[PDB]
């Protein structure tokens, strides 16, 4: 009542695109327990790396790394199908317990972070300062990753659909589509959002027949 | 310099799950133009409805509706493949121009909202008050929709994979999988997050062979 034990900065993990995904928001009073389910970025991925982060930045690299661990034994499956439940649990003592559990296999791996770990009081103040100073740059970074991830899904999906269509897909169409896919994959390797969007657009313009078949 | 023309509340649209997705954040100075690409929720969906919202609530229904319009002519395609670019553009006069463009067909539909539309000064204050009053309830709603949407993807994907596997999928497996899919679909129709998660878990526990084949 006179005081409150609170988390000075956000706590979360690094997700595809190098972005920090928050599990426990800034100024949350502890004890607290939050969870979210994630999945694999690649087909047949056998493990996921849980990189714990403390901070207010959108770029995972600009945040304080609290540590990392892997969860392996993930059985063969298309990307995005596995269910890896990640739980952040801060107890009364202020100790953070992070766990990752594969819902198919039931396997789990944990990392425990002492209450004194993370950033100190001044550093916390600097983090809040920088986050505010770089609010626009972070917004730009967030939309870039949104674009890159959408393009990756398009690339990955389209390729699956082409295979599944086989001879159903006319030669003219498959030629246009595959050129656009190669162009898209090259774009995804860069940092130019407009370029990525341009290649997704080209793909959308030449995939109409494929989409009809896949549908 | 002495003053700044700013957006008092967030502006965005309603996305699947009845959640408000922000395009232009609160306290943004105008003129400003932001965009984001969305897609269809269902296979062969021929149109998307753009419901413009003003407010700070996570539930679209708890926000101020500025209006809505449809973009039709979307060609047959699997759900999540179409690219509908939605742009929010507020000019110097304070007029909001919202557009939706299908990148495949190039078709576009717009709605223009006068600067005097939306919520008035007091209402703005009430909106900020309520958003803060319901920060937890909104968090719960957000995670519920995250869960429901993840389950929907699982349901939809699994069904596609079962078809694509055909005889490759053993009878015992297909029986377990399809029961779990029916159970999952029922859960998705409710508001119980744990129940939805339970059915996704069951599906993850009996789909191992399917996942191997689909992979």
């Amino acid at each position: 009542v006179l005081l409150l034990d609170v988390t000075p900065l956000s706590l979360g993990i690094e997700t595809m695109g190098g972005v920090m995904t928050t599990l426990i928001a800034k100024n949350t009073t502890i004890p607290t327990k939050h969870s979210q389910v994630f999945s694999t970025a690649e087909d047949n991925q056998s493990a996921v790396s849980i990189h714990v982060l403390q901070g207010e930045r959108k770029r995972a690299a600009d945040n304080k790394s609290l540590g990392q661990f892997n969860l392996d034994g993930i059985n063969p499956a298309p990307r995005g199908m596995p269910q890896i439940e990640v739980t952040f649990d801060i107890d009364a003592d202020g100790i953070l317990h992070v766990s990752a559990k594969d819902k198919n296999s039931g396997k789990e791996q944990k990392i425990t972070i002492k209450a004194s770990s993370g950033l100190n009081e001044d550093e916390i103040q600097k983090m809040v300062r920088d986050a505010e100073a770089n609010a626009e740059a972070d917004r730009k970074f967030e939309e870039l990753v949104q674009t890159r991830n959408q393009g990756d899904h398009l690339l990955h999906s389209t390729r699956k659909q082409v295979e599944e269509a086989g001879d159903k897909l006319p030669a003219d169409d498959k030629t246009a589509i595959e050129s656009a896919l190669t162009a898209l994959e090259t774009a995804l390797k860069g940092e130019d959002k407009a370029a990525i969007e341009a290649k997704m657009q080209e793909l959308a313009q030449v995939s109409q027949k494929l989409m009809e078949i896949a549908q | 310099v002495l003053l700044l023309d700013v957006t008092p509340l967030s502006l965005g649209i309603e996305t699947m799950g009845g959640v408000m997705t922000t395009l232009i954040a609160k306290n943004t100075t105008i003129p400003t133009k932001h965009s984001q690409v969305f897609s269809t929720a269902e296979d062969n969906q021929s149109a998307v409805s753009i419901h413009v919202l003003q407010g700070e609530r996570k539930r679209a229904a708890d926000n101020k509706s500025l209006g809505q319009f449809n973009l039709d002519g979307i060609n047959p395609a699997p759900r999540g493949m179409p690219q509908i670019e939605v742009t929010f553009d507020i000019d110097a006069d304070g007029i909001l121009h919202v557009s939706a463009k299908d990148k495949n067909s190039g078709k576009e539909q717009k709605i223009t909202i006068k600067a005097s539309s939306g919520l008035n000064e007091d209402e703005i204050q009430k909106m900020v008050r309520d958003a803060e009053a319901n920060a937890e309830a909104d968090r719960k709603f957000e995670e519920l929709v995250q869960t429901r949407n993840q389950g929907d993807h699982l349901l939809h994907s699994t069904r596609k994979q079962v078809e694509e596997a055909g005889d490759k999928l053993p009878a015992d497996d297909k029986t377990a999988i399809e029961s779990a899919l029916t159970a999952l679909e029922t859960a998705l129709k409710g508001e119980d997050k744990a129940a939805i998660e339970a059915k996704m878990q069951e599906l993850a526990q009996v789909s191992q062979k399917l996942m191997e084949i689909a992979q």
Binding site: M16, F38, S39, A41, Q45, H51, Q68, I84, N149 | -
Partner: peptide, 7 residues
């Protein structure tokens, strides 16, 4: 639907 890499 958020994905994780393998390092």
């Amino acid at each position: 639907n958020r994905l994780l890499l393998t390092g």
